[PDB]
Structure formats: structure tokens, C-alpha cells
Amino acid sequence: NSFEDPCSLSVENEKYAQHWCSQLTDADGPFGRCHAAVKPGTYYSNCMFDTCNCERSEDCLCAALSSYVHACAAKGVQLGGWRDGVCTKPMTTCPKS
Amino acid sequence: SILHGPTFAACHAHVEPARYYEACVNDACACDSGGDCECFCTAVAAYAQACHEVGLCVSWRTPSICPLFCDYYNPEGQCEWHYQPCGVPCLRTCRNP
Amino acid sequence: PVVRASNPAHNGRVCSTWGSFHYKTFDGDVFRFPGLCNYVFSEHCGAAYEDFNIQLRRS
């Protein structure tokens, strides 16, 4: 294990990750209804690290957000409508019917 | 960054420096009312004590990084007091003859 | 620590890029790399804390 900080290696990656992963910790954002059931700090850290690290930043950001959404759903909290903005591509691309 | 460099390289396999580094950075950011060097010294000494407790006595204090004025305790004409990372659990005193 | 200096030729401390993707390293190796992406020109990776990190991009 090394003490790497990928977000410090790129300005634009840091800006993108901070802009899109901070919605997890926003009290009034799409994920604000779940801050009581599930604590979003670990998911925010995972989102930042994955977005700054992997080449397909949007895929890792969407994976982290979906992981938080699934953890919320395991607690009985529904967060529908969270894909507005980013992570909307999976909504449209799926089988015809 | 001292908590991630060669100074504590031997301890990195026995004490995880993640939370200690985070506390160091947060305290140094928040120690804005005066005496940030005390905040930094306390934050690094926490990790140093954690390292020393598990048998690893690293020498991290330098005249520019949290110096210790041991010579202050030397009586006039004497030179006895030395810095010990491990400490001396059974130095000879007259309370433990 | 006293460090003396007498030789004024300091080409070993200079790295540069010029012309048609021509690169000269600090050690004197001149090569060509026609990359148009974002690359790390030079960064201080030899310490726990990084003093500098310079990146360049071509179009």
C-alpha cells in the first residue's frame, strides 16, 4: 500500500471529481434524503479516489453514486431521480422494448 | 508529508499512518489562532507514540522539526540528559533502587 | 555543507523541448516523441512532498 493522492496529480480531474462527487455530502441534493440512514463520507472518498484515478472518470463516478444509492435502498430509502445531470447515459441505452 | 516519507518508513508496516496524516493536515489547517507548530508536533507525536508502543523507536525530532531542549536539564558543568525514542523504562532511581 | 563550483557548463541542469517534437532530457539524451497528449514535463517525485510538477500539452 502506497500513500498516493491521484486527485493531486491532475487539476481537471480534481475539479470534475469535486464537482460531481460532492453531491453525496450535499444535505439538499439528490442524495440528501439518505444522510441519516447511511453516512456518505466513505462513499464520497471512494468517489473522489476512483474519479481521479481511473481513465474513464464518468464510469467510476457513476459506479460510486450507484453504490451509495444501492446502500440507501438496502435501508429502505428511495432516491429516484438522482441520475439528472451526470450518469444519465444508462437511462437511454438499453434494449428496444 | 513527514508522516509519509523515509522518516517513518519502518513504522509504515506496523502502524497505519492514514488517520494520523489526516488529523495532522486538519489540525494544521485549523491551528490558525497561533501556535501551529504545537498542533503539528502533537499530531506527529501521536503517530510517533503509536510507533514506539509496538517496539519501533524511530528518531524523528530534528532541530527544525519539534526540537527537545534536553540540555536545559543539565546542571551547571554536567552533561547527562539525552533524548531517548525508546525511553528508559528502568533507569536507576531511588524510588526504584 | 560547503559545495564548490568552478565549471560554468551546466547543460546537465537544463531540459527543453523545441521544433518538431524534439526533447532533451537533463542528462543530455536528445530524442523525438510526436505525442499530442498531456504529458509530465518534469516533477519532483523523489521526495514525500512534491516541490514542483510541470505538465505540457501540444496541439
In degrees and rounded to multiples of 5, residue A61 shows phi and psi of -60, -45
Helix residue ranges, H only, chain A: 11-21, 41-53, 57-74, 89-92
Q: Which residue has the cell 509519509?
A: B4
- Smallest Cα distance from C31 to chain B, Å: 34
Judging contacts by C-beta atoms under 8 Å, the chain C residues touching residue B65 are none
In degrees and rounded to multiples of 5, residue B7 shows phi and psi of -60, -45
Name, in order, each residue with C-beta under 8 angstroms of C49's C-beta and a sequence gap of 6 or more: B1, B5
State the Cα–Cα distance between residues C49 and C56, nearest whole angstrom.
Answer: 21
Q: Which residue has the cell 496541439?
A: C59
- Minimal-distance CA residue of chain B relative to A2: B4
State the Cα–Cα distance between residues B19 and B2, nearest whole angstrom.
Answer: 14
State the Cα–Cα distance between residues A26 and A86, nearest whole angstrom.
Answer: 16
For residue B65, list its beta bridge partners. B62
Judging contacts by C-beta atoms under 8 Å, the chain C residues touching residue B6 are 48
Residue B43 in grid coordinates: 499530531
For residue B42, CA distances in Å to B13, B72, B95 come to: 22, 21, 30
Name, in order, each residue with C-beta under 8 angstroms of C32's C-beta and a sequence gap of 6 or more: C20, C21, C22, C23
Judging contacts by C-beta atoms under 8 Å, the chain C residues touching residue B1 are 47-49
C30-32 vs C22-24, strand pairing mode: antiparallel
How many residues does the structure list for chain A?
Answer: 97
Neighbours of A45 (CB within 10 A): 13
**First-last CA distance in chain B:** 43
Decide if C49 and B5 are in contact by the 8 Å CB cutoff: yes
- Smallest Cα distance from C49 to chain B, Å: 6
State the Cα–Cα distance between residues B92 and B78, nearest whole angstrom.
Answer: 18
* B92 residue type, one letter: R
Judging contacts by C-beta atoms under 8 Å, the chain B residues touching residue A41 are none
For residue A39, CA distances in Å to A89, B21, B45, B71 come to: 27, 22, 30, 50
Structure-determination technique:
cryo-EM
**Interface B-C: count of C-beta contacts within 8 A:** 9
- Minimal-distance CA residue of chain A relative to B22: A3
Torsion of CA B25, A37, A51, B21, to 10 degrees: 20
Residue A23 in grid coordinates: 453531491
